[PDB]
Amino acid sequence: AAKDVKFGNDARVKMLRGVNVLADAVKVTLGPKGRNVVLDKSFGAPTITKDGVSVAREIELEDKFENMGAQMVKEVASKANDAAGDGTTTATVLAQAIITEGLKAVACGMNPMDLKRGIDKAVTAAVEELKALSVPCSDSKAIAQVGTISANSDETVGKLIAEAMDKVGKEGVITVEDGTGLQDELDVVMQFDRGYLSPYFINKPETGAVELESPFILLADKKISNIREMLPVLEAVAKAGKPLLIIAEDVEGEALATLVVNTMRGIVKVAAVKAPGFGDRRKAMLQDIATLTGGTVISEEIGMELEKATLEDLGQAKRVVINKDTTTIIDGVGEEAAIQGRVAQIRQQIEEATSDYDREKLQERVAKLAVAVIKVGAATEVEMKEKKARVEDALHATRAAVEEGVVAGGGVALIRVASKLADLRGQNEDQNVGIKVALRAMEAPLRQIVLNCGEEPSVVANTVKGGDGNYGYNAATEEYGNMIDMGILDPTKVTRSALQYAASVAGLMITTECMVTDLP
Amino acid sequence: AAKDVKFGNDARVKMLRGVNVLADAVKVTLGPKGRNVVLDKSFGAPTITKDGVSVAREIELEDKFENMGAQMVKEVASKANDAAGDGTTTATVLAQAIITEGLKAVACGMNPMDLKRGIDKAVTAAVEELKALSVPCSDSKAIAQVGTISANSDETVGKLIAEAMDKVGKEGVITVEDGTGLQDELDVVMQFDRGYLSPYFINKPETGAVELESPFILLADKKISNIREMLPVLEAVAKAGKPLLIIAEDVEGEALATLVVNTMRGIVKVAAVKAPGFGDRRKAMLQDIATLTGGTVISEEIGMELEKATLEDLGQAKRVVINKDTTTIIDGVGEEAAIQGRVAQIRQQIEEATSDYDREKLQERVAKLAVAVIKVGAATEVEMKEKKARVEDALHATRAAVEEGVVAGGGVALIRVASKLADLRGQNEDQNVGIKVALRAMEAPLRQIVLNCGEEPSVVANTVKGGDGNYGYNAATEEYGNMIDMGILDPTKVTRSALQYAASVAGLMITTECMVTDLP
Amino acid sequence: AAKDVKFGNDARVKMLRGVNVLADAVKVTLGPKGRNVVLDKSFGAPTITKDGVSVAREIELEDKFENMGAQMVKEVASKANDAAGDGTTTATVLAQAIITEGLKAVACGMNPMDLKRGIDKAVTAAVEELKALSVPCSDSKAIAQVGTISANSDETVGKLIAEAMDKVGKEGVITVEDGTGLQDELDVVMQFDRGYLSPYFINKPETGAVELESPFILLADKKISNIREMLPVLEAVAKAGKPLLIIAEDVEGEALATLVVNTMRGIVKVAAVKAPGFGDRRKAMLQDIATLTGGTVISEEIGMELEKATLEDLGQAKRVVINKDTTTIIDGVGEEAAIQGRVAQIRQQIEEATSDYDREKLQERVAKLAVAVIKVGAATEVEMKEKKARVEDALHATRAAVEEGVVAGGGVALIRVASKLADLRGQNEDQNVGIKVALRAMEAPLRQIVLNCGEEPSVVANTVKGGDGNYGYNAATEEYGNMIDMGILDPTKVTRSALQYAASVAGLMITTECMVTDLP
Ligand SMILES: Nc1ncnc2c1ncn2[C@@H]1O[C@H](COP(=O)(O)OP(=O)(O)O)[C@@H](O)[C@H]1O
Ligand SMILES: Nc1ncnc2c1ncn2[C@@H]1O[C@H](COP(=O)(O)OP(=O)(O)O)[C@@H](O)[C@H]1O
Ligand SMILES: Nc1ncnc2c1ncn2[C@@H]1O[C@H](COP(=O)(O)OP(=O)(O)O)[C@@H](O)[C@H]1O
Ligand code: BEF
Ligand code: BEF
Numbered sequence A, B, C: 001a002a003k004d005v006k007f008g009n010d011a012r013v014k015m016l017r018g019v020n021v022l023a024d025a026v027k028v029t030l031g032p033k034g035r036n037v038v039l040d041k042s043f044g045a046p047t048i049t050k051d052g053v054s055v056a057r058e059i060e061l062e063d064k065f066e067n068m069g070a071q072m073v074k075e076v077a078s079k080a081n082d083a084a085g086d087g088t089t090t091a092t093v094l095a096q097a098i099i100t101e102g103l104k105a106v107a108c109g110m111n112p113m114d115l116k117r118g119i120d121k122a123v124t125a126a127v128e129e130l131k132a133l134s135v136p137c138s139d140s141k142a143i144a145q146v147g148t149i150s151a152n153s154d155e156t157v158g159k160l161i162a163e164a165m166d167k168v169g170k171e172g173v174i175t176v177e178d179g180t181g182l183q184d185e186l187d188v189v190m191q192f193d194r195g196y197l198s199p200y201f202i203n204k205p206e207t208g209a210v211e212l213e214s215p216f217i218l219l220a221d222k223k224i225s226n227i228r229e230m231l232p233v234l235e236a237v238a239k240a241g242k243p244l245l246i247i248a249e250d251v252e253g254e255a256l257a258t259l260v261v262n263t264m265r266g267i268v269k270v271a272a273v274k275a276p277g278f279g280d281r282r283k284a285m286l287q288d289i290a291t292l293t294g295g296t297v298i299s300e301e302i303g304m305e306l307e308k309a310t311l312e313d314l315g316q317a318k319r320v321v322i323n324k325d326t327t328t329i330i331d332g333v334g335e336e337a338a339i340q341g342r343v344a345q346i347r348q349q350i351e352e353a354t355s356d357y358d359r360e361k362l363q364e365r366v367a368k369l370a371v372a373v374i375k376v377g378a379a380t381e382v383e384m385k386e387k388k389a390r391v392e393d394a395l396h397a398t399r400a401a402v403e404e405g406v407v408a409g410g411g412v413a414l415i416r417v418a419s420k421l422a423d424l425r426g427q428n429e430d431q432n433v434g435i436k437v438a439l440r441a442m443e444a445p446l447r448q449i450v451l452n453c454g455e456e457p458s459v460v461a462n463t464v465k466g467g468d469g470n471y472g473y474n475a476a477t478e479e480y481g482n483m484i485d486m487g488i489l490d491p492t493k494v495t496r497s498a499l500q501y502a503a504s505v506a507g508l509m510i511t512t513e514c515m516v517t518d519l520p
């Protein structure tokens, strides 16, 4: 289609105007005295949220150029989210603050491509400075604090995540789901979503569930319909005394019917449950179980009959628990060599996962082998969704603090790094201005946090810069102090990520001399 | 449809106005103090780029005639790209500079078709003059410099490409891909795009790949479905101790199933992978592998059964590595006589290749026998794509410098050729003006590079023309000197290509007396 | 009326756009390779002119703010004209060149009010530097040159003005009028536009005019109708032998009739002519004549009867010449003390003249007492008016060169002053930039002159700045040399005036932060 082509200052002013709309919608949520944004949503109720990327993703403007602005800087907020899990607002605030200052310089005749070089150099330095300030965070108290700050000063959420990480470990997974109840709730566990096929198996009507004591485990890839196939293996289990769990694609009536009357009487004690999953993921998951239990997958496709299985090919576990909905294998016989080998394999399967969905289900399986769920409570569903948005962010920040330490929040970390790089210079004057652009931008987070409290950002910034180390402004309490003592901890990973991504995009955006888009 | 028909000056003014929009969008990216262009893109985020053809391809104007202008001159930028790989902006700048000057002459009553003859003559001369100035470029230092200048003064990219060409050789291929990491990365290897057929073969779950130590290699032209055919050869490998790779058209279930349970247990260690390619190219490539490994292709078509193969007909290698996507044969037993004989054969197959596509896949195979990938690092994805655009350009220029030498950059090469052709005349006055049009256009690259630094192009041009040999303007450092000493090298091939293509199109465009297009 | 109010950058961009239209229309006429502007004019034929103020005065723009721009800077061109008489284009070119550079600085955050202080300081210095370079110009050759350059390289006009000033002196007046003839023409002369009332007075039918030898002169304020009033004075003249001129408001029939028959016969020799002027100007002019002739105005209003006059109250002259159209008094008896006293009185009457018309008729009378007329020749009337416009400008420049010396033209004078003030600084950085703004503007005249020749202004500017003293570019001949040797002389007064006035206005214009005007 015919294009509209704009040059130079015109193009840039438009590009900025756009950036500002997105920026300005996201910045209002920054900090403890941040407010929420309402995002209309065609199919049903609107969404209230504080989560900066969520606001960002919705912005799309009418004017084709302004839109381009907003659509590029949207990537800062968006990438922060994909790497860190928090800091998306901060990232957005920095980006704006660079772009704005940089473009002002470009308008003064300075060479954009050098302004970029400056910015980038200043940032590579700032990243290293932040790694210096970073003190690690591994005690449950510190984690609870990060969690708390991350969930907009909600101590319960901190406490609850800290408890969760304590219980699953660090090689263990935590999910968040909508609760049915009005208050928050933590559940901890290998298990999968499949119940008994035969309700006449429940050997403990107390719980309404089957409790097989120290049983064998048969892993059938194919779906079973005839009892003929079972007889060989069923025989060896009947003369072994131990019970048996059968996890095949399905246990059909003809072969199910029998199995029932056999446990009915006490000839063998057997359970039947469908296989966890669908398609290639099922065979993959079914294999995971074999490794945990020391059994062989009896895959009909790769040249095995179900009749030619023996006790050899059966897995074993310490105990098994199956109800109407879920099956649980407690402590399988499989050797931890084979297990961690199988895990470091699935760990690198998540590396080559180019899609988010391919990553979800993979780390689910590694947790089953190396798991907790937080249920979020709220009165209504508008409430549910802002809360659940904060819990996720919190969890992410906690995992990030663990893996890369913490720094003083309230945007002070960045303000310090800026004073430490006060002597940084480049190859020429334009690059210098470029550095100074970035350092001045490093103040923006603190400045905006203060501005969302309706207090004079210049005055607070000055006072924090007059101090040392972890002296900062506590925006919630409206007085100064030691940010680490007051529990105001940002993960290093997030603060770093915010800065790197803002710089990457904003840097390039300053180099714009022409814009090409479709006509209206 | 009904047409709008315009004549003479009206038609030309429109045609120019169009050229200028495209030209003017591309010219802003020229040179080290060049800036970037933003190209909106319907499905997701916009693109920032310096790459002149990329900008050009997007231009399409509303006014039906102006569009025609832009759509014709778009071919200069586009063809430069397809032949050279760099110089697309330069090409575009020349084209404009001719068209503009030529049309001005046409308006003065001079006979276009002669102005063309002049231009073309001046260019045929300039091409030869450039071949004189060309000094070859074969040491890694010179190549790194071309690479560097080509990637807008990014020394890492130069260094990295220079290292690459040093390692793959000159009969070896280099690709560029998006990196996962934040910094640039070079990987070097025979390999082909095929994974294991049987995921139950991975003998090292660390990498999630099969690592067959010093194995035999079976090359089956036909597709396998029955284990009967394998037994004779499988037998001799089972009593030899060494593992076996099977590279046939396909390993079907019945014959696959078995092979699995055999390595499953440790009876033989075998891998199964499809054959690289399709049709006649497959048999050709399958044969290449036989030569590298000292094996025989067991081609069912030319009177061989798979059962009548023995250890005799199997290839051998030092090591084999196969994952989900690719199979690699490290250091095959095949004798280097047979190999280089097979290569000098495929080398002359590329000579008779009259189509580009027939040339692509052929030199791919010669590289497999005589390969590297550069992964580009960046923070975000907007960044990734401008960088990856520069790396490709750089690589192209380096390969072009190697094959046709270098000349002084900063557009001086052309400025010299213009002073050397100061005595060139034609058959009549109009042809003379035509020559002078081209020579004056030869200054444009330097002039625009200087103009993107915001300095007086006339003043710099004068000063460079006052000098000799490789005296030029260094736009980055803003002072004059010896361009070769300062590492400012353009490949001859690109400078030549730019000039030839601009001239070809612009020449014709000057001959326009009528334009016919659809009504609005 | 309701106002539109614009602030800051918006207001300034508009203001500039306006300046540029006016500037851009005037700048095209600068220099020897300057072109002409056509100004439409409601009542009849349009006007072709080179005269920069004439173009300026017509510019008025539609957009209310742009207009304000143009309407303010119009004053530069206009004031230059009222003080100097030439340099109006130059003045306009400087003004633009300041405003443009200054506003660019204002946009960079520099404090306008300081930029002004800088500019003004740099100019006060430049004014003094110009007075240093000024060499006086008093020989007819130098004046002819100034005249020539001023009339766009028309040697005749130079020659002709030089001749004129040589003949009238420096205390003598030169006017320019439309000629009837096709070629230029100079006439030299106290006289006024009144013929004899009585055609029967002509005492020399050769010329058809009255030639009264060494006569008395009667100055009657009132209009005469009765011969009674005359008898007393007529008597004393009849017994004195000398003739008599009668310059009253009118000589009515009854008193005219008689006077005729008296000279008819030879009783007295008398002439009768109306008084020069109308109303208060008549009595004023009639008084001028009394002073030149040593007579008394017989004013009926201030208590004098015409009968009570004697030979006492009559003026006297060496000779008198009267024809059908004009009366001339050659060399009156009045003492030069009384004359120059009367002149230095009328000289200060022109000082308090706040209207142009009050100034016209006053300097006419001072010329009658302290005269030459140039008649301009041309074929048509479009031609007449561009030529007459150049002659006036030339005359002005010549009178200015005489009173304040000359400097090297081609705008070099200013370029030198700029290199001499290269060390000038202010009280702070913004003031420094302000100085540099002015010095850079000083190059504009030369740069535009060169640009109207279609040659590279940067290249010429550089080459002139590389030289010394009066080395400059001769735009007419297209080669460099000594501007004074080549006769390319600008009057100091004009070059100074241009600079001062541009600076005054442009200085203020840079301080604009808000604009208030009526709605559309
Ligand atoms: N009580 C507080 N005083 C000052 N700063 C705080 C306080 N609580 C949180 N913050 C800071 O405000 C920032 C707000 O983060 P948030 O608004 O969730 O946006 P983001 O997407 O950038 O995490 C945190 O980095 C934290 O440093
Ligand atoms: N530092 C420098 N000084 C002067 N010229 C340079 C410098 N670096 C690169 N160039 C020149 O500028 C040209 C810019 O090429 P580029 O802008 O990528 O457009 P193209 O598509 O024509 O390669 C190169 O040919 C090179 O000669
Ligand atoms: N032959 C020449 N070469 C260079 N400069 C010239 C020549 N003739 C005139 N000039 C310069 O050009 C200027 C032109 O004056 P003009 O165009 O009449 O505008 P203005 O209203 O400023 O006098 C003069 O100041 C003179 O210095
Ligand atoms: F805006 Be962040 F994700 F808290
Ligand atoms: F514009 Be080129 F491809 F560097």
Ligand code: BEF
Pocket (backbone or CB within 6 Å): C050, C051, C052, C053, C085, C086, C087, C088, C089, C090, C393
């Ligand atoms: F424009 Be000037 F009065 F010659």
Ligand SMILES: [K+]
Pocket (backbone or CB within 6 Å): A029, A030, A031, A034, A050, A051, A052, A089
């Ligand atoms: K937020």
Ligand SMILES: [K+]
Pocket (backbone or CB within 6 Å): B029, B030, B031, B034, B050, B051, B052, B089
């Ligand atoms: K380019």
Ligand SMILES: [K+]
Pocket (backbone or CB within 6 Å): C029, C030, C031, C034, C050, C051, C052, C089
């Ligand atoms: K003029």
Ligand SMILES: [Mg+2]
Pocket (backbone or CB within 6 Å): A086, A087, A149, A150, A151, A393
């Ligand atoms: Mg947060």
Ligand SMILES: [Mg+2]
Pocket (backbone or CB within 6 Å): B086, B087, B149, B150, B151, B393
């Ligand atoms: Mg290039």
Ligand SMILES: [Mg+2]
Pocket (backbone or CB within 6 Å): C086, C087, C149, C150, C151, C393
């Ligand atoms: Mg003049």
